[PDB]
Enzyme design. Structure first.
Site, short mmCIF file in Angstrom:
data_model
loop_
_atom_site.label_atom_id
_atom_site.label_comp_id
_atom_site.label_asym_id
_atom_site.label_seq_id
_atom_site.Cartn_x
_atom_site.Cartn_y
_atom_site.Cartn_z
N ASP A 88 -2.00 -7.13 5.14
CA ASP A 88 -1.55 -6.90 3.76
C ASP A 88 -2.64 -6.34 2.82
O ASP A 88 -3.84 -6.58 2.97
CB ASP A 88 -1.04 -8.24 3.23
CG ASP A 88 -0.38 -8.03 1.88
OD1 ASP A 88 0.70 -7.45 1.86
OD2 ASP A 88 -0.94 -8.47 0.87
N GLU A 104 -1.33 -2.33 5.86
CA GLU A 104 -0.44 -1.85 4.82
C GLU A 104 -1.31 -1.16 3.77
O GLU A 104 -2.05 -1.83 3.04
CB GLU A 104 0.31 -3.00 4.14
CG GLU A 104 1.24 -2.51 3.02
CD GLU A 104 1.30 -3.42 1.78
OE1 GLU A 104 0.47 -4.34 1.63
OE2 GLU A 104 2.19 -3.19 0.94
GD GD Z 1 1.53 -6.01 0.18
#
Ligand code: GD
Ligand code: NAG
Ligand code: CA
Ligand code: GD
Ligand code: GD
Ligand code: GD
Ligand code: GD
Ligand code: GD
Length: 475
Positions: A206, A230
């Site tokens: 993330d 990401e």
């Molecule tokens: Gd994110």
């Protein structure tokens, strides 16, 4: 597992709190607007693996497993897992350590992989950034572990993007100072132990663009498994360079033009075609990227159009494009929620039907992809090549000569007229018999090498040599 191991995988991405409850209920209340814990658990996922594997997926990606902030904030609970506070404890809402280990065992039992979502950028806190009691974070129980409190005002300022805080004063996301050796050593030791303890095969990272680049190499190495990051940006020149410090990244560059090409009958096929070539050319390795058109941070595809032909086309693209296919739980049931929190609908409320139109499409697409890969070791590294394109069509070829899969997509929609497309550049030898593995029909390559593709109802067409299908239960 290694990056090479991951190229052949197909991922079903799910929100642990929203996929399946331990009791298997399909009526348990979950109003996305409430933003609370709806009850999804790891044990629940185990009981629905037949449903997932039935679509041909080889792996799942689940949201973060670390303990979160306890409070029900003004923005709800930490049901999504991105507001962690104690990284050495698991989120009790999903189950126990034994349950997470049972999940990884259940997947391996089926020859599947477990990918876990991890956050290194920030913790979560219920309240203004100024009210943060750093003693609640474990092991980062001191403000010395964090960057000074500031919000990201200009996302075009990379220093701000990396040094200031995400979120706001309602729910703040204390930004770890990832430049400090203490923070690096801690995260590196943690990730290695996390992967070892739960037999994790891969990681999804993330908010990678929010952490300075020099942090990631050490993180990816300590993890000891394939990692896909990401990087939330559609510019390939910004996103693809992260593949030099990380094995792969989510294909946001393709996402935007892919969505635009099919969300309506007037989308740009040109932009999608050129982006495929741009990523093919500029990204370190397009085959290590993750293709998607739907996730928890954007409106679902069906929110733009409920035309199920358009939905079938984009699903086919995701599965047959370069890289690892990634489908978001609910997409197979034609879910249409908008932006957060509307796109975090509970999968169980659909009833899990295995005969839904999109479930069948995905199963058929994954089926030929999985089969082709077992037929051809060169398929995964064979660069997807766009062979044709016009106002309403795009065609591509992937796979070694003689075993290639040729896909024809259309955004004409369900009311699309029936006609015949004389496709050229498929690479098949003249006279070769092919099978359209989606609708399960046969077609012979013209004497000129061109394929007379039967086009109807804006349906996608996927071709493969008929003789190669012997043995398969496909078609
Ligand atoms: Gd994110
Ligand atoms: C890994 O397992 C050990 C005990 O077996 C535990 O003490 C440690 O906290 C775990 N590490 C992580 C990152 O979960
Ligand atoms: Ca940061
Ligand atoms: Gd069970
Ligand atoms: Gd089974
Ligand atoms: Gd940007
Ligand atoms: Gd950008
Ligand atoms: Gd280039």
């Amino acid at each position: 597992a290694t990056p090479a191991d991951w190229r052949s995988q197909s991922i079903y991405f799910l929100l642990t709190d929203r996929f399946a409850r331990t009791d298997g209920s399909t009526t348990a209340t979950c109003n996305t607007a409430d933003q609370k814990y709806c009850g999804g658990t790891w044990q629940g996922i185990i009981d629905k693996l037949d449903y997932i594997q039935g679509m041909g997926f080889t792996a799942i990606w689940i949201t973060p497993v670390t303990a979160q902030l306890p409070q029900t904030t003004a923005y709800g609970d930490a049901y999504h897992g991105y507001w962690q506070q104690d990284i050495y404890s698991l989120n009790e809402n999903y189950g126990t350590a034994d349950d997470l280990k049972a999940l990884s065992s259940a997947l391996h039992e089926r020859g599947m992989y477990l990918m876990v979502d991890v956050v290194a950028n920030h913790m979560g806190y219920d309240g203004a950034g100024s009210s943060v009691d750093y003693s609640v974070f474990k092991p980062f129980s001191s403000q010395d572990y964090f960057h000074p409190f500031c919000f990201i005002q200009n996302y075009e300022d990379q220093t701000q993007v990396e040094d200031c805080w995400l979120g706001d004063n309602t729910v703040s996301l204390p930004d770890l100072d990832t430049t400090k050796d203490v923070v690096k050593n801690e995260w590196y030791d943690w990730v290695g132990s996390l992967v070892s303890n739960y037999s994790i095969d891969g990681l999804r990272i993330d908010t990678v663009k929010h952490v300075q680049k020099d942090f990631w190499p050490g993180y990816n190495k300590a993890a000891g498994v394939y990692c896909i990051g990401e990087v939330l940006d559609g510019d390939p020149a910004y996103t693809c360079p992260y593949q030099n410090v990380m094995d792969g990244v989510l294909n946001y560059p393709i996402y935007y033009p892919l969505l635009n090409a099919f969300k309506s009958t007037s989308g740009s096929m040109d932009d999608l075609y050129n982006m495929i070539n741009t990523v093919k050319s500029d990204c370190p390795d397009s085959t290590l990227l993750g293709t998607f058109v739907e996730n928890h941070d954007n409106p679902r595809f069906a929110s733009y159009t409920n035309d199920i032909a358009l939905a079938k086309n984009v699903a086919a693209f995701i599965i047959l494009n370069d890289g690892i296919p990634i489908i978001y739980a609910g997409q197979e049931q034609h879910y249409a929620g908008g932006n957060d929190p509307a796109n975090r609908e509970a999968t169980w409320l659909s009833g899990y039907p295995t005969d839904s139109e999109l479930y069948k499409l995905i199963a058929s697409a994954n089926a030929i992809r999985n089969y082709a890969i077992s037929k051809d070791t060169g398929f995964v590294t064979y660069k997807n090549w766009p062979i044709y394109k016009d106002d309403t069509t795009i065609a591509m070829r992937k796979g070694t000569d003689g075993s290639q899969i040729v896909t024809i997509l259309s955004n004409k929609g369900a009311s699309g007229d029936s006609y015949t497309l004389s496709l050229s550049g498929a690479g098949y030898t003249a006279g070769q018999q092919l099978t359209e593995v989606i609708g399960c029909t046969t077609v012979t390559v013209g004497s000129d090498g061109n394929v007379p593709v039967p086009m109807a109802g804006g349906l996608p067409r996927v071709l493969y040599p008929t003789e190669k299908l012997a043995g398969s239960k496909i078609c």
